[PDB]
Design a protein around this ligand. Structure first.
Ligand SMILES: *[C@@H]1O[C@H](CO)[C@@H](O[C@@H]2O[C@H](CO)[C@@H](O)[C@H](O)[C@H]2NC(C)=O)[C@H](O)[C@H]1NC(C)=O
Ligand SMILES: *[C@@H]1O[C@H](CO)[C@@H](O[C@@H]2O[C@H](CO)[C@@H](O)[C@H](O)[C@H]2NC(C)=O)[C@H](O)[C@H]1NC(C)=O
Ligand SMILES: *[C@@H]1O[C@H](CO)[C@@H](O)[C@H](O)[C@H]1NC(C)=O
Ligand SMILES: *[C@@H]1O[C@H](CO)[C@@H](O)[C@H](O)[C@H]1NC(C)=O
Lengths: 110, 86
């Protein structure tokens, strides 16, 4: 498409879903948030409360469950997954989010 | 469907004295956030339900100068997307 560096918006991808206890691990179609976001560092030193930067991040989320195959009797096999409705560009709040750098393509079974 | 500005050197116009501009690395860099994988959760004392992977428009090189009396600004001279939590 036309954008060269697309602003943060949900993009669908497949993510590995599995529960500790069932033989298999599956993948489901969902939407995650990925895109570009405007950042910048201050030039002025005397670094007054250093400017925190933004990351492409979830806005409105929805959840969808799935029943895992192979699960033995007893174990609960329904596993819910988050699906991105709205994505926005805001800071990474370290309380709920794991704010880190690029791990190359972690969305995968095995 | 939206575009984002390349991460490049713009000119800061509060510190730029004519014939003495101060450059700032402004721009957009790729980032993404998906739900934390099971593997990872089994690594956390405090479970984080979301993982954010991010790069950021920062200075590759720069020189700390002083301007307009006593401002001690760092004047950038090359940009790139890099580790965000430096
Ligand atoms: C801040 O750094 C810039 C970058 O080198 C300095 O300005 C450069 O000056 C040359 C000659 O006029 C020109 O190519 C551009 O104006 C700047 N470089 C580039 C690559 O565009 C500037 O002098 C520095 N400021 C101070 C106070 O030292
Ligand atoms: C990650 O966990 C946070 C914390 O619970 C979730 O944020 C809450 O989401 C629920 C709906 O799932 C809302 O009712 C709450 O108001 C939210 N609270 C806060 C403090 O954010 C978030 O939905 C989860 N995100 C994902 C992708 O699973
Ligand atoms: C997610 O949006 C549509 C939904 O039908 C999907 O076909 C498309 O491949 C995904 N978008 C991107 C940018 O991958
Ligand atoms: C991925 O998930 C849904 C699940 O029903 C699928 O139909 C569609 O291709 C994608 N969702 C959206 C909102 O694009």
């Amino acid at each position: 498409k036309e954008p060269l560096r697309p602003r943060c918006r949900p993009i669908n991808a497949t993510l590995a879903v599995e529960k500790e206890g069932c033989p298999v691990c599956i993948t489901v179609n969902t939407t995650i948030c990925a895109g570009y976001c405007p950042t910048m560092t201050r030039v002025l030193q005397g670094v007054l409360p250093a400017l925190p930067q933004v990351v492409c991040n979830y806005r409105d989320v929805r959840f969808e469950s799935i029943r895992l195959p192979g699960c033995p009797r007893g174990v609960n096999p329904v596993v819910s997954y988050a699906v991105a409705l709205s994505c926005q560009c805001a800071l990474c709040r370290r309380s709920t989010t794991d704010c880190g750098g690029p791990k190359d393509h972690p969305l995968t079974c095995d | 469907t939206q575009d984002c500005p390349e991460c490049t050197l713009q000119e800061n116009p509060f510190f730029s004295q004519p014939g003495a501009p101060i450059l700032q690395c402004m721009g957009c860099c790729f980032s993404r956030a998906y739900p934390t994988p099971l593997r990872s959760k089994k690594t956390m004392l405090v479970q984080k339900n979301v993982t954010s992977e991010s790069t950021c428009c920062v200075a590759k090189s720069y020189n700390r100068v002083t301007v307009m009396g006593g401002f001690k600004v760092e004047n950038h001279t090359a940009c790139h997307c890099s580790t965000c939590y430096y």
